[PDB]
Amino acid sequence: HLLSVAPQQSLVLLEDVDAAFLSRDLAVENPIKYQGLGRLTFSGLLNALDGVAS
Amino acid sequence: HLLSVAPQQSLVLLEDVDAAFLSRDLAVENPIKYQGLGRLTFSGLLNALDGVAS
Amino acid sequence: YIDRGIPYRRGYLLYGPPGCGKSSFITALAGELEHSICLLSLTDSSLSDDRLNHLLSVAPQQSLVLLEDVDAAFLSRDLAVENPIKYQGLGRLTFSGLLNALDGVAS
Amino acid sequence: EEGKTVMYTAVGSEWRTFGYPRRRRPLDSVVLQQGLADRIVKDIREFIDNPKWYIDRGIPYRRGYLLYGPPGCGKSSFITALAGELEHSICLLSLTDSSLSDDRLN
């Protein structure tokens, strides 16, 4: 919703993306675990940045 | 309930199904653990996709 | 059943590889016997032992209580050999609760 | 409720009736090891009939039983039959509950 209601003529800024999810060892590992605080998931982020409803 | 009240002439799209549950090593392991955020289970998804109430 | 004191209950188990026709046969049988199907999810979050007993006590008449994929509710094999049969679910259900609900004193 | 067995349950911090009074299971319908049922019934009936023997010696007037064995041998059925025989009611208790605490258990 937030990516769908951004004000016109604006640059959405996702700063320090690498801190959102585990990487390297866990990237090779099957799950891309979410090392955050809320209810955001890697697949959700992928679909939000470029998916069907983008 | 959601799969039973889907609007007519519509495609239900479960994108990135692999992230819902563990896989491979854990698939060989006895439990198919749900690595999600909610209260969904593998048996629940299997029954919803094709079960008795589908 | 009554003349010999046996509880008037019965249960059935259908096991096999996936895609062989367990759920379809259950639906066909429920249609044939003019019964209804009571879908009960063991691995729910709001299901407790007292709630399970109450639900199994107020099931509609001429109905088939359907516990599908029973093996997913509790751990097995290694944990079955292990002292506790851990409940790999979300609610507050235990193995002894299910055992007593299926066949106990208040069943 | 006579001719049937009432089964209570833990509702909050009180015992409340659970469902309707179940029909009694005849005692002879449960076949245990030879003479075991007679021994248990004799013990429990003797305990019930003699409270003075406990009071005159200061022993607390309580008694507890344990039935252990492989599943499918007749423990729960025998308990139901004994409750029917003694015309008592059954107060089901689930130790592994979520609302159960020490004070609530007491």
Added chain:
Amino acid sequence: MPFSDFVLALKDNPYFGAGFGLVGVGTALAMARKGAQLGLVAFRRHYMITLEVPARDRSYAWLLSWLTRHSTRTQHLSVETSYLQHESGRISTKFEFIPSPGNHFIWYQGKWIRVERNRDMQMVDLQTGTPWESVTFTALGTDRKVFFNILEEARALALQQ
């Protein structure tokens, strides 16, 4: 002193005579209000039949379904959207109407029942969505068999269709 002096004082004022008559008016009004309450209570107790169905019984669902079916030409309905599967194999929307809350009148068995849909009050209940909705069956008469027949017909219709 309070007895003799006041009576002379009250008799001195001609407005007391109008005022004392107004005391009779006030007592009569209080008596009139009390008479209404006792009369209503007696009438309800002796000549009316009442059956309330809470939201915690399956009888509530059965009776609601039977009321939705047998609603005559009631013009205080509320909509209910559902998907109906035709025998052709496809599913189309089903516009089903259920009587909206209010006072509805039926003519079952030659009587005039006053079925009424009690609405949500405090959004507290159990085993449901917690609306605490109810229906009250009120009618003029003394026999209880009307409501029993209604309940049996509701169960039969639930087992029907």
Added chain:
Amino acid sequence: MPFSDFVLALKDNPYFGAGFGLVGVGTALAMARKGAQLGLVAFRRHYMITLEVPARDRSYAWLLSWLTRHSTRTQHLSVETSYLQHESGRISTKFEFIPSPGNHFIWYQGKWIRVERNRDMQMVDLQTGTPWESVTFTALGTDRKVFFNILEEARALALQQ
């Protein structure tokens, strides 16, 4: 004593005659108030049609959209901001007006429907943001087909545009 003495005592006071006349005034006022209620109930039951749509049905969304479109020149609207993607490829702000809560009048099929946007009462509901909003269709008449036609037109327009 209570019968004979009071009759003389009341007759002694001429204000009782004025007071007893006032008793008839109170009785008539209570009867007039009750007469209004029965008349209103009978008129609503016999000559008016009511259709309530809660917010728990998709019919609510369809009917709300149809009301927003077909509102004639209603001057009790409320704003609703959204972004419209033009065919040119860019997106600009879109100002859409939805009838604000209140009593609104339409002239669909020669009648005068009295649509009313029910407002939030206790902020409790399910399957939504919990505002418990509803719409009531009130019109004078006995036929029910007008509301069904409205619902079908709403579904068609939802499938349209």
Added chain:
Amino acid sequence: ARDRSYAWLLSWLTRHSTRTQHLSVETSYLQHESGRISTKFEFIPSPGNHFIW
């Protein structure tokens, strides 16, 4: 109700209530000296206005 005096005074009011006819029931299990326990019907004056002498 936050003082032990409340409990003591409630007990004394239940005991010395004269012939108050606005009581409320209170069920408790009483152990008889014979070794058995039977139901005990104890009445506590229901909330309202009561008068003592």
